[PDB]
């Protein structure tokens, strides 16, 4: 769907 | 459905810019399917935003997390679909070394590939 996967730490 | 063809360069740059402005601590990544692949299940998400302290090993697991697989079969994550890189390397290293023209880092997942 053309959108970000935001991962952290 | 490769990203470099979907989006024109300037658009990709704009995106990279806005998002690096949005999250100045994180690397922008594009993971795609090896077009010669037929065995593996497709990946639902296309763009990943990753910290710098993240290793390739961790990212691979995260990518695996988005897919339903038999807990054993692994696959290869090619950077620029041509680079087998150190499993221990951080996103920052991979970023500085293999930054594409538009600011993204491009990856490709394949169960098998021959060069």
Author numbering:
A (entry chain B): 3 to 11
B (entry chain A): 1 to 115
Lines quoted from the article behind this entry:
All six mATG8s are essential for autophagy, are conjugated to autophagosomes and serve to recruit two broad classes of molecules: autophagy receptors and autophagy adaptors. On the other hand, autophagy adaptor proteins interact with mATG8 proteins on the convex autophagosomal membrane surface and can regulate autophagosome formation (ULK1/2 16), autophagosome transport (FYCO1 17), crosstalk with the endocytic network (TBC1D5 18) and autophagosome fusion with the lysosome (PLEKHM1 19), but are themselves not degraded by autophagy. Structural studies have shown that the side chains of the aromatic residue (Θ) within the core LIR motif are placed deep inside of a hydrophobic pocket (HP1) on the Atg8/LC3/GABARAP surface, formed between α‐helix 2 and β‐strand 2, while side chains of the hydrophobic LIR residues (Γ) occupies a second hydrophobic pocket (HP2) between β‐strand 2 and α‐helix 3 (reviewed in 3, 23, 24). To provide a molecular basis for the specificity of the PLEKHM1‐LIR interaction with the mATG8 proteins, we solved the crystal structures of PLEKHM1‐LIR in complex with the LC3A, LC3C, GABARAP and GABARAP‐L1 proteins.
LC3C could not be crystallized as a chimeric construct, but co‐crystals of LC3C with the PLEKHM1‐LIR peptide (residues 629–642) diffracted to 2.19 Å resolution. Partner residues in each mATG8 protein are given W635 of PLEKHM1 interacts with E19 of LC3A with 3.5 Å distance, with D19 of LC3B and E25 in LC3C in similar way, but the bond distances are higher (6.2 Å and 4.5 Å), suggesting a weaker interaction. For the LC3 subfamily proteins, the hydrogen bonding distance of N637 (LIR) with K30 (LC3) correlates with binding affinity to the LIR peptide. For LC3A, two of the four monomers in the ASU do not show this interaction and in LC3C, one of the eight monomers in the ASU do not have this interaction, suggesting that this interaction is variable in the LC3 structures. In the LC3 subfamily proteins (left plot), R70/70/76 (LC3A/B/C) side chains are closer to the CG1/2 atoms of V638 (˜3.6/3.7/4.1 Å), while for GABARAP subfamily (right plot) these distances are 4.6 Å (GABARAP) and 4.2 Å (GABARAP‐L1). Due to this closer proximity, R70/70/76 polar groups become more fixed in their position and organize neighbouring negatively charged carboxyl groups of the D48/48/54 via salt bridges. V51 GABARAPs’ side chains are in close proximity to the PLEKHM1 V638 (3.8 and 4.3 Å for GABARAP and GABARAP‐L1, respectively), while side chains of residues in equivalent positions of LC3 subfamily proteins are further away (LC3A/B/C V54/V54/V60 – 4.2/4.6/4.6 Å). Similarly, GABARAPs’ L55 side chain are closer to the PLEKHM1 V638 (4.6 and 4.8 Å for GABARAP and GABARAP‐L1, respectively); LC3A/LC3B/LC3C V58/V58/L64 are distanced to PLEKHM1 V638 at 5.5/5.4/4.3 Å. Superimposition of LC3C and GABARAP‐L1 α2 helix (having biggest difference in orientation) in other projection (obtained from structures above after rotation in 90° around x‐axis).
